[PDB]
Tab-separated table of N, CA and C in Angstrom:
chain	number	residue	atom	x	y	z
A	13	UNK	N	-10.073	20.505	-9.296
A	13	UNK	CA	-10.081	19.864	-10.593
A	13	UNK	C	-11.131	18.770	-10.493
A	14	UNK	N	-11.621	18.641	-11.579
A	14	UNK	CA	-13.370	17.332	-11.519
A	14	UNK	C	-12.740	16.171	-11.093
A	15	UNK	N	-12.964	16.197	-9.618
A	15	UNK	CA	-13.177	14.687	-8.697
A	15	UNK	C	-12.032	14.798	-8.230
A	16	UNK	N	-10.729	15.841	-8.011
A	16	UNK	CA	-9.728	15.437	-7.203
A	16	UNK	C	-10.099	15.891	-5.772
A	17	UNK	N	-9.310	15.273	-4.881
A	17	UNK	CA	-9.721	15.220	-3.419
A	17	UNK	C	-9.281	16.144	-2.824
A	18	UNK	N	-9.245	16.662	-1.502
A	18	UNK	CA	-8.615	17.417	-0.738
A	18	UNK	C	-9.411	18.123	0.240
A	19	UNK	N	-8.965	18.601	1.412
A	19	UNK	CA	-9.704	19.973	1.802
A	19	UNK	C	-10.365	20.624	1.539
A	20	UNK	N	-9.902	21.299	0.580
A	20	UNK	CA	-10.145	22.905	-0.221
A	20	UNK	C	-11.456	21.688	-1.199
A	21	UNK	N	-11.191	20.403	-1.684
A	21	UNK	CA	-11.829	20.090	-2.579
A	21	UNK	C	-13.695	19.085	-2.182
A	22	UNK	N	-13.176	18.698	-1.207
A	22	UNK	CA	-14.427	17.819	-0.740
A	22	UNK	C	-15.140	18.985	0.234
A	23	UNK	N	-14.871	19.463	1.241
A	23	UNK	CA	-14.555	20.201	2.318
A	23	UNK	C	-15.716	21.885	2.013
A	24	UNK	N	-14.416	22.339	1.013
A	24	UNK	CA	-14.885	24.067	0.937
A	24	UNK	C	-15.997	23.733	-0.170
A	25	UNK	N	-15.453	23.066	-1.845
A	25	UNK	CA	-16.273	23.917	-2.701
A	25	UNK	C	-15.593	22.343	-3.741
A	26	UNK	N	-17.015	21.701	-3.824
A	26	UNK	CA	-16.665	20.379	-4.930
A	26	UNK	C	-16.730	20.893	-6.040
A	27	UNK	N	-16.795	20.051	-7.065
A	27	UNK	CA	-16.855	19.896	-8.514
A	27	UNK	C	-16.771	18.747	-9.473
A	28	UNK	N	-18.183	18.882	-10.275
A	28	UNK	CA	-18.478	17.247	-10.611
A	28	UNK	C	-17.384	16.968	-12.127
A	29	UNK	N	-17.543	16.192	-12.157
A	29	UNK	CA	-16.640	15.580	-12.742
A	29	UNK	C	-17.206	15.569	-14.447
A	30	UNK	N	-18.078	15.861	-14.534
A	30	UNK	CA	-18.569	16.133	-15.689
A	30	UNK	C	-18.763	18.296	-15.599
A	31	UNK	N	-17.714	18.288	-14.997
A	31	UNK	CA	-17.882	19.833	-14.821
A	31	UNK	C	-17.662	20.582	-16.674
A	32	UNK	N	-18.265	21.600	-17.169
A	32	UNK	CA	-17.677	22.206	-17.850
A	32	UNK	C	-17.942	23.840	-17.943
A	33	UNK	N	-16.582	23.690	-17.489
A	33	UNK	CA	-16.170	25.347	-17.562
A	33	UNK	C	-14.539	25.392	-17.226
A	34	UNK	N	-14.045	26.936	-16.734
A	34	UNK	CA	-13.311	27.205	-16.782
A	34	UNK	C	-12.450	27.496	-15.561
A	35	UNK	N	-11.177	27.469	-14.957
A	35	UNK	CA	-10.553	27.557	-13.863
A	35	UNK	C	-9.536	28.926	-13.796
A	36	UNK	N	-10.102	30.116	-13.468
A	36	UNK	CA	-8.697	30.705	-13.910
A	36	UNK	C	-8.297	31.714	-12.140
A	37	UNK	N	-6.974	31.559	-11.870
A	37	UNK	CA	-6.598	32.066	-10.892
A	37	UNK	C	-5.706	32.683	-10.809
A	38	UNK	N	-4.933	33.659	-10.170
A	38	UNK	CA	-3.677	34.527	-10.326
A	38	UNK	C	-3.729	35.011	-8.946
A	39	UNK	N	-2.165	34.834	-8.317
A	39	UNK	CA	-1.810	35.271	-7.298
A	39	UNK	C	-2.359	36.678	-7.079
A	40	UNK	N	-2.666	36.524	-5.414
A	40	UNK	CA	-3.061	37.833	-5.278
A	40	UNK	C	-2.528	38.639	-3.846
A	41	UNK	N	-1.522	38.406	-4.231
A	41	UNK	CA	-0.607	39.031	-3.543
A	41	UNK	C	-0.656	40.639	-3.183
A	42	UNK	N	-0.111	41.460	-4.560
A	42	UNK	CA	-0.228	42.476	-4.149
A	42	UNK	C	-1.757	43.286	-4.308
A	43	UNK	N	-3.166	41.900	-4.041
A	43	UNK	CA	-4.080	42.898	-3.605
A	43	UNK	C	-4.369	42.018	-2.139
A	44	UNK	N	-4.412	40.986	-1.839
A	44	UNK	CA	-5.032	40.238	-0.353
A	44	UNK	C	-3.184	40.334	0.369
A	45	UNK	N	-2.154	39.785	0.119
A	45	UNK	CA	-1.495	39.347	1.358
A	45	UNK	C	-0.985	41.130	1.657
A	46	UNK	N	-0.956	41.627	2.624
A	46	UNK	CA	-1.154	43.002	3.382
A	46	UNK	C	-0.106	42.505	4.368
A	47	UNK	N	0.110	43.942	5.134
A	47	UNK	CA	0.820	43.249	6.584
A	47	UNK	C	-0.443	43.258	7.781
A	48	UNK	N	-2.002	42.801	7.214
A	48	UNK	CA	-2.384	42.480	8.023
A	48	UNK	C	-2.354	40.862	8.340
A	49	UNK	N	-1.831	40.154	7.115
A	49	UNK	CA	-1.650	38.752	7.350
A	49	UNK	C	-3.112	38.255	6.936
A	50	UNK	N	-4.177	38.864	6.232
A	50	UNK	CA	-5.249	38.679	5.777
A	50	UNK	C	-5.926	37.001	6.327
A	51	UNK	N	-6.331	36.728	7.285
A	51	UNK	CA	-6.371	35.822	8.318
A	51	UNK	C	-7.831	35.662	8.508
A	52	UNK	N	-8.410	36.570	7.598
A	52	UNK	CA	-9.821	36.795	7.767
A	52	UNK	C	-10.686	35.274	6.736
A	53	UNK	N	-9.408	34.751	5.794
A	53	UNK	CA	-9.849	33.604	5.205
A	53	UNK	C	-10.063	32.833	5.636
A	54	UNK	N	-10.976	31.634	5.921
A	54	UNK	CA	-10.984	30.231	6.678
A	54	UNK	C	-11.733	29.243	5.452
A	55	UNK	N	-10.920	28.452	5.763
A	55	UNK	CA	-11.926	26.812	4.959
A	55	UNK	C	-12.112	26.104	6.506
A	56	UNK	N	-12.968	24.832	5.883
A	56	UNK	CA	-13.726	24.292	6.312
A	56	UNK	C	-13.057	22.877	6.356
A	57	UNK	N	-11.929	22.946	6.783
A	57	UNK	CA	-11.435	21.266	6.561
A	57	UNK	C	-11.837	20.263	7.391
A	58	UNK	N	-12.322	20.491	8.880
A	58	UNK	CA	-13.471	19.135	9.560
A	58	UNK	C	-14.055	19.672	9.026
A	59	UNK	N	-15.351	18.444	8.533
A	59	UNK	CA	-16.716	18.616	8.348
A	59	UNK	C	-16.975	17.275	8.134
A	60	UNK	N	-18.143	17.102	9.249
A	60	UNK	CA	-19.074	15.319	9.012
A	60	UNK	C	-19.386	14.690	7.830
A	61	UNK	N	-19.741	15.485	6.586
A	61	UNK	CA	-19.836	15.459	5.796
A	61	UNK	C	-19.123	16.084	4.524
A	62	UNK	N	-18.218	15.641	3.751
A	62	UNK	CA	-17.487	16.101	2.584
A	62	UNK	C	-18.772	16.672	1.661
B	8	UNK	N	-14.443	-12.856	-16.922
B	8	UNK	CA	-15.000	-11.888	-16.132
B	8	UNK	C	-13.694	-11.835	-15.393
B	9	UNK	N	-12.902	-12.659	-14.930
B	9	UNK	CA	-11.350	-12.573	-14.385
B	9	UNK	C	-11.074	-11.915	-15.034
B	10	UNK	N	-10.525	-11.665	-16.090
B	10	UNK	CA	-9.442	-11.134	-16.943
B	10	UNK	C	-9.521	-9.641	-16.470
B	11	UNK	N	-8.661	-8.833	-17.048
B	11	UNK	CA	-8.833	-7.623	-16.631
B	11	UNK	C	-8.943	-6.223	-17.587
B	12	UNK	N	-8.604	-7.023	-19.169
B	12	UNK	CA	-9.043	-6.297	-20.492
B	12	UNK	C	-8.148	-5.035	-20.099
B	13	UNK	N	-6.866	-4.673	-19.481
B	13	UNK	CA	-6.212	-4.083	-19.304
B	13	UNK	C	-6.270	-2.765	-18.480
B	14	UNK	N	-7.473	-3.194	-17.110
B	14	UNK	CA	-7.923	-2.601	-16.252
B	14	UNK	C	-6.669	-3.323	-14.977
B	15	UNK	N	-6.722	-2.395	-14.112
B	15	UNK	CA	-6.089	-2.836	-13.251
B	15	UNK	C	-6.496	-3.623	-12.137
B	16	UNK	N	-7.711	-4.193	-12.296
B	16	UNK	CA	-8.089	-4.884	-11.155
B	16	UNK	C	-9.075	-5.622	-11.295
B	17	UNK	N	-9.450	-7.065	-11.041
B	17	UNK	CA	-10.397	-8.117	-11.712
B	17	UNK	C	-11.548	-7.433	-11.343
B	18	UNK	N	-11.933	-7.555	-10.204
B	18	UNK	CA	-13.287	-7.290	-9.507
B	18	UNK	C	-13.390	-5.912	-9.546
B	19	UNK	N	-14.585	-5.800	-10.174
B	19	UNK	CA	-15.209	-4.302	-10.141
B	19	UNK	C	-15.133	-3.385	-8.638
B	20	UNK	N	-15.770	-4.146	-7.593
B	20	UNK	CA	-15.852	-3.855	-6.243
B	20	UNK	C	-14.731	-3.289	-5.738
B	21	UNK	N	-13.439	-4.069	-5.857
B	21	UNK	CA	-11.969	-3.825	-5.593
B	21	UNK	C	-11.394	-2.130	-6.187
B	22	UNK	N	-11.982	-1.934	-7.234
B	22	UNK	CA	-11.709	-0.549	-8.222
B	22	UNK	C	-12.703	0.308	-7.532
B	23	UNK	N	-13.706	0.065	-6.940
B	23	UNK	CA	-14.505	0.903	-6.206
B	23	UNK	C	-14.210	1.307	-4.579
B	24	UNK	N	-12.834	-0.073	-4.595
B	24	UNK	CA	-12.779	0.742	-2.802
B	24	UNK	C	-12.094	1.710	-2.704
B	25	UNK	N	-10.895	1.896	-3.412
B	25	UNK	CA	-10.426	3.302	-3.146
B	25	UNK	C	-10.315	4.229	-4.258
B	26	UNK	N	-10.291	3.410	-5.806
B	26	UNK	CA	-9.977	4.162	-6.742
B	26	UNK	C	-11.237	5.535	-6.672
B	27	UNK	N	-10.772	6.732	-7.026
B	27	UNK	CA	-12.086	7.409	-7.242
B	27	UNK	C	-12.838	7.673	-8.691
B	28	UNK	N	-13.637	8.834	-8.604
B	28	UNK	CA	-14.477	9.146	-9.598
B	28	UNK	C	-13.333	9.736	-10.947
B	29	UNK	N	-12.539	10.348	-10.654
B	29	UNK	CA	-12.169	10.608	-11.476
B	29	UNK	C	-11.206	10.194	-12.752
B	30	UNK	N	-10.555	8.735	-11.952
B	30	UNK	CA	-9.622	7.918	-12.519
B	30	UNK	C	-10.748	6.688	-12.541
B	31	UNK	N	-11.684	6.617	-11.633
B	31	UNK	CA	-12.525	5.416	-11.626
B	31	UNK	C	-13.343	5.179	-12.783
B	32	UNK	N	-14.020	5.937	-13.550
B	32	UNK	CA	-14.658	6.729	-14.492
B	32	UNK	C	-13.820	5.908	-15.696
B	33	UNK	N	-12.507	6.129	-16.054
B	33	UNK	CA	-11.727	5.261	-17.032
B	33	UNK	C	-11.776	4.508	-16.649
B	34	UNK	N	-11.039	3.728	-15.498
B	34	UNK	CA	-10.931	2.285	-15.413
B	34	UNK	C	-12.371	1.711	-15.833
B	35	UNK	N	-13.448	2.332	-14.990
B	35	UNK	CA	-14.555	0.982	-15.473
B	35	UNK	C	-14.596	0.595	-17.119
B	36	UNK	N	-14.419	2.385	-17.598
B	36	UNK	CA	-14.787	2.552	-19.061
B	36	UNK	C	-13.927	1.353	-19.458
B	37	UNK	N	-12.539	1.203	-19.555
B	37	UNK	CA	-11.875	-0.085	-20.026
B	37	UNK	C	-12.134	-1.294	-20.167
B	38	UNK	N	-12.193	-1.484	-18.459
B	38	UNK	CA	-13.358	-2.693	-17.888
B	38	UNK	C	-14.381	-3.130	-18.848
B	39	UNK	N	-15.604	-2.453	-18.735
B	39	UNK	CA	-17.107	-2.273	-18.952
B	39	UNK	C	-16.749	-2.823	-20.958
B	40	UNK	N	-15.880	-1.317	-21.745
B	40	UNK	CA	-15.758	-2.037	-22.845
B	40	UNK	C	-14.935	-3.904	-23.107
B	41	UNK	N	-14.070	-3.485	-22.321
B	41	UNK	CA	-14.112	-4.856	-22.319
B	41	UNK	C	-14.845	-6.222	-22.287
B	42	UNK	N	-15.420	-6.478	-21.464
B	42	UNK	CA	-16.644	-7.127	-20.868
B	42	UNK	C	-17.663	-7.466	-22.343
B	43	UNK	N	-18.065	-5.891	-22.327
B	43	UNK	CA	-18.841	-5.743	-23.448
B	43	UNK	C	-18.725	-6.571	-24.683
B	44	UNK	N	-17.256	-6.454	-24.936
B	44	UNK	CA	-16.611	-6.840	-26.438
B	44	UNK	C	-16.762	-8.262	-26.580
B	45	UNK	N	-16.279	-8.679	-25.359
B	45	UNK	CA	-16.436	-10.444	-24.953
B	45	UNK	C	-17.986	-11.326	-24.894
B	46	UNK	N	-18.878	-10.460	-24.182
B	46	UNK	CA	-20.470	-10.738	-24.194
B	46	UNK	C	-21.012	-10.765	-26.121
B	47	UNK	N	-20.495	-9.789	-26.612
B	47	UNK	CA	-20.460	-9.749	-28.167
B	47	UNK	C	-20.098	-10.441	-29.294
B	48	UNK	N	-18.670	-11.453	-28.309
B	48	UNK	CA	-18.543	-12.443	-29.342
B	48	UNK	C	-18.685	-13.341	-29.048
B	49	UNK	N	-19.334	-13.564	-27.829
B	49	UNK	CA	-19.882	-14.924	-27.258
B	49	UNK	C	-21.344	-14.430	-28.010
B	50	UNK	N	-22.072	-13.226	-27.950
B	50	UNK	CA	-23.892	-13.655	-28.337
B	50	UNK	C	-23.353	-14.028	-30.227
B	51	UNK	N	-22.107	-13.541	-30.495
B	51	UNK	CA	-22.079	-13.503	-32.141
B	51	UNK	C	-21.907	-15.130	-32.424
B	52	UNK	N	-21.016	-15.653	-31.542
B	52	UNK	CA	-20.915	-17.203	-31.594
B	52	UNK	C	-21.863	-18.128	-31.648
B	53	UNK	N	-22.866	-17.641	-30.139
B	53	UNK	CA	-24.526	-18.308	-30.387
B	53	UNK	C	-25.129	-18.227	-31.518
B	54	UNK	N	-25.132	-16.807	-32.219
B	54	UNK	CA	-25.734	-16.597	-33.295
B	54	UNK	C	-25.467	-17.692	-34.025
B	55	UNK	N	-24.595	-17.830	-34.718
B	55	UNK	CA	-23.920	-18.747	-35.820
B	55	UNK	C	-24.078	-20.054	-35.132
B	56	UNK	N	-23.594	-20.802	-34.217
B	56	UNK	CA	-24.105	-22.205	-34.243
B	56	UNK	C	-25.857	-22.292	-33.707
């Protein structure tokens, strides 16, 4: 969300605060969580720089 | 410049140490109009005397 903090937010993938557009997401369960445990995802939460 | 025009914090600097961009962004706006409004009726006061 424009300028909230976090991991996922400074870290993976910002967004300015004068952002305009749109956010849309939906569980994705029955296409990513598998019984492989889909593990293949990683963020980036150290980083020297946000 | 004390006052706080219904910002939460006198000093600008103080709102800049932790508040962020996204809540920071209003507060100054409050601030800043504030300030503003006051500089306005102090130059409107000069005016007239």
């Amino acid at each position: 969300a424009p300028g909230q903090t976090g991991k996922i937010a400074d870290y993976n993938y910002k967004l300015p605060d004068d952002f305009t557009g749109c956010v849309i997401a939906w569980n994705s369960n029955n296409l990513d969580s598998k019984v492989g445990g889909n593990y293949n995802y990683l963020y980036r939460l150290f980083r020297k720089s946000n | 410049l004390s006052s706080n025009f219904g910002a939460i914090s006198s000093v600008l600097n103080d709102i800049l140490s932790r508040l962020d961009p996204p809540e920071a962004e209003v507060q100054i706006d409050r601030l800043i109009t504030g300030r503003l409004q006051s500089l306005q009726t102090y130059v409107t006061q000069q005016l007239i005397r």
